From TrEMBL, chain B:
InterPro entries: Centrin_CML-like, EF-hand-dom_pair, EF_Hand_1_Ca_BS, EF_hand_dom
Species assigned in the record: Chlamydomonas reinhardtii (Chlamydomonas smithii)
GO cellular component entries: organelle
Keyword flag Disulfide bond: no
Pfam families membership: EF-hand_7 (PF13499)
Name under which the protein is recorded: Outer dynein arm-docking complex protein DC3
Keyword tags: Calcium, Repeat
Top-level taxon of origin: Eukaryota
């Protein structure tokens, strides 16, 4: 969705992507916390010490 | 929808630490209006002549006496939690400016942070408050920020 937007990124002639980037920055941290839950969530029962 | 507050708050705790440190004149847990006035001298402006009691009339009524860090961390909750129902916004906004002040003068073009965690919306939310031109917006101080927010609280009333 970020890499389909009409404006050229290198141009400061638009200066409206500064809301797209600060919307991007919240679902990146959402992705972060999702992966943190993923690590916390696939180790609840492990068959061996060694495999896990 | 409500993803905004999390990564605000988690980093916000650390800057809240030295914010409350450098705000306090004696560097202690107790908070008085003398600390307020000497901090306004640290900003170097001239506070208005009712600023001693400007946070107490309609808003700081349920509790009593002198406030401290207990009251500080109480009222620091009182900002993000509340809704479009009109809020007690008395002493926070100067602290919000101060921790958003990382150039010892004011700031540029960072209020859109304080509206994006407020709301995802177009430039209307900005345009009611100020008129930040994206090339160069303005240079800010505590006077402009406090007057604009107080005027908008009165205007929405």
């Amino acid at each position: 969705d970020v890499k389909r937007k009409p404006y050229d990124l290198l141009d400061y002639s638009r200066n409206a992507f500064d809301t797209d980037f600060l919307e991007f920055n919240v679902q990146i941290n959402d992705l972060e916390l999702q992966l943190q839950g993923f690590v916390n969530a696939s180790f609840e029962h492990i068959t061996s010490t060694e495999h896990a | 929808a409500a993803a905004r507050e999390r990564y605000a708050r988690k980093n916000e705790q650390n800057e809240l630490e030295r914010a409350f440190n450098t705000i306090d004149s004696k560097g202690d847990k107790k908070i008085d209006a003398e600390e307020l006035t000497e901090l306004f001298l640290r900003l170097g402006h001239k506070p208005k002549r009712g600023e001693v009691e400007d946070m107490i009339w309609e808003v700081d009524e349920d509790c009593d006496g002198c406030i401290s860090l207990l009251e500080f961390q109480t009222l620091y909750t009182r900002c993000r939690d509340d809704k479009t129902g009109y809020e007690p916004r008395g002493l926070f906004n100067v602290v919000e400016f101060v921790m958003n002040d990382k150039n010892n003068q004011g700031f540029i073009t960072l209020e859109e942070a304080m509206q994006i965690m407020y709301l995802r919306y177009g430039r209307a939310e900005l345009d009611m408050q100020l008129e930040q031109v994206f090339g160069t917006a303005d240079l800010n101080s505590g006077k402009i920020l406090t007057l604009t927010e107080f005027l908008h609280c009165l205007h929405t009333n």
